[PDB]
Design a protein around this ligand. Structure first.
Ligand SMILES: NS(=O)(=O)c1ccccc1Cl
Ligand SMILES: [Zn+2]
Length: 258
């Protein structure tokens, strides 16, 4: 049936339903740190998450989304390479079956244990659905996770996962503050790319932070106890929900730092 991450419906199949899978600005990519070019004209990123309103967390059968109220300018991203204001609509993760894999972007071929995506849409296009139809419609902030010490501001997410074990379950998830997921530094690489899941629209400015956050072994362990299937189906653990690195082709990765 439909796309997933298994042997029969995984990334090497997606192009059949989604020919853009082999397009010119696909994500994720390997970030060759020696080839990315310092661009002294990029500004500092501006993450304004003080007023963020989270609503809900949901298992959509590929990952879990923590969803925000994006009907006003309450949590925005601006600056960096971005023109205009992008509102936070959701974040999710991609993670592995083992600590040695899980991230979508890689750094000099290094795979991290998981990668967080904070998904924002350009408010000149009025909603998320219109933004994805535009070459500068989305801005995703990518943050790598490595396993070491626990990240305290992730724990509230880890502790609700038992309640959304299977596809289609959701749970109320208000008053969660995503500034607790950020690393200290905001140095980044940026390039134009795509959703890394179907429909793989080429609508994203990717902003990937150099500095990983660390989470504990028990934290990422809880991610791996999720299910891709729906309740009362045979259990397929939700792991390795990451697309591998795609050809860079005709793109340059720019760095905010030297
Ligand atoms: N993995 S991703 O590219 O951030 C993504 C996934 C689903 C919807 C929107 C986006 Cl930007
Ligand atoms: Zn993602």
């Amino acid at each position: 049936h439909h796309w997933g991450y298994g042997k029969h419906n995984g990334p090497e199949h997606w192009h059949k339903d989604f020919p853009i899978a082999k397009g010119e600005r696909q994500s994720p990519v390997d970030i060759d740190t020696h080839t990315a070019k310092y661009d002294p004209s990029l500004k500092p990123l501006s993450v304004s998450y003080d007023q963020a309103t989270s609503l809900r967390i949901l298992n959509n059968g590929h990952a879990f989304n923590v969803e925000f109220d994006d009907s006003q300018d309450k949590a925005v991203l601006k600056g960096g390479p971005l023109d205009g204001t992008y509102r936070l609509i959701q974040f999710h993760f991609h993670w592995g079956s083992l600590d040695g894999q899980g991230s979508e972007h890689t750094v000099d071929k290094k795979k991290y244990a998981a990668e967080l995506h904070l998904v924002h849409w350009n408010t000149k296009y009025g909603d998320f659905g219109k933004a994805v139809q535009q070459p500068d419609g989305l801005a995703v902030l990518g943050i790598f996770l490595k396993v070491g010490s626990a990240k305290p501001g992730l724990q509230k997410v880890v502790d609700v996962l038992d309640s959304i074990k299977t596809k289609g379950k959701s749970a109320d998830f208000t008053n969660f503050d995503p500034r607790g997921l950020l690393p200290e530094s905001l140095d980044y690489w940026t390039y134009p790319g795509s959703l890394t899941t179907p429909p793989l629209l080429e609508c994203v400015t990717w902003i990937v932070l150099k500095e990983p956050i660390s989470v504990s072994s028990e934290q990422v362990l809880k991610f791996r106890k999720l299910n891709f299937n729906g309740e009362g189906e045979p259990e397929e653990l939700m792991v390795d929900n990451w697309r591998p690195a795609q050809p860079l082709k005709n793109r340059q990765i720019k760095a905010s730092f030297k």
